[PDB]
Write an enzyme that holds these catalytic residues in place. Structure first.
Site: not given
Ligand SMILES: [Cu+2]
Ligand SMILES: [Zn+2]
Ligand SMILES: [Cu+2]
Ligand SMILES: [Zn+2]
Ligand SMILES: [Zn+2]
Lengths: 156, 153
Positions: A49, A51, A66, A74, A83, A86, A123, A146
């Site tokens: 993603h 952020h 995100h 999400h 998002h 995403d 992640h 993360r």
């Molecule tokens: Cu992320």
């Molecule tokens: Zn998201």
């Protein structure tokens, strides 16, 4: 003028995870091509993603949630409800190497969905694409911690 | 009231946090923070073209120079947009950074978001060095630490 057409990101963390991810958008409202390689990963799927914050002061945890300018829940990159950041999952082969090549039309390198100066993240676990059945899944996809991040920046 | 941040890292002991604030469009930007690990003295300090760290601070390119001018000090008219002058590190090796520039900006066409902040080995001679290097890099030498300038809360 100066709307970015190319960006790059160097992902790093406290572990063995690191890679280089390139972005490319030759048309202002066109899609963005994300490609690169990430190594040190466990075989399988890993969340991926953009952020909100290009703040690495406290590692990847300072990058915030995100990137969610439209205040959506999400989801997967193909879902309407998602998002902006995403981007779904990247897949690591048996040797920890995750070749990445995805193309996304929600994120932009310029404009209101602009991602320049924010943090790309990969992640520990898979992004359940919001289908997890708990409020956490609506927030993060239960993607876990993360492992590596870096600030998305303008590329020559 | 735009705000940004930059974590400076390198292959050596230099490392710091540098905050930016531009409370108004096309207005002045406040650059403040701390950089440890410096050698007592002044160290070059600028924004470079590219937020590209794929080859360390080298891949960040030259000083942000959209106008294609020669290097200078930040009070000069003939300067690179990225030319923020010097910072000073005490006998402790700690440099307390506090600058205010009206040429750089956190938004606009020439915004520095997504570009790279670099702290150099030597002092920036502000283009008065008498050699072609002075008119490009100010003879500030190798790049000790750098980070991508990113959007902060
Ligand atoms: Cu992320
Ligand atoms: Zn998201
Ligand atoms: Cu420099
Ligand atoms: Zn320009
Ligand atoms: Zn310069």
């Amino acid at each position: 003028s100066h709307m970015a057409t190319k960006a790059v990101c160097v992902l790093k963390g406290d572990g063995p995870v690191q890679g280089i991810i390139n972005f490319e958008q030759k048309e202002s409202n066109g899609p963005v091509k994300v490609w690169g390689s990430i190594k040190g990963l466990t075989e399988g799927l890993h969340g991926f993603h953009v952020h909100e914050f290009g703040d690495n002061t406290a590692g990847c945890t300072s990058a915030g949630p995100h990137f969610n300018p439209l205040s959506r829940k999400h989801g997967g990159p193909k879902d309407e409800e998602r998002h902006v950041g995403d981007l779904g999952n990247v897949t690591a082969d048996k040797d920890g190497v995750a070749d990445v090549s995805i193309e996304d039309s929600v994120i932009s390198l310029s404009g209101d969905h602009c991602i320049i100066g924010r943090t790309l993240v990969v992640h520990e676990k898979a992004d359940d694409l919001g289908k997890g059945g708990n409020e956490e899944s609506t927030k993060t996809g239960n993607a876990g911690s993360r492992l590596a991040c870096g600030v998305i920046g303008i590329a020559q």
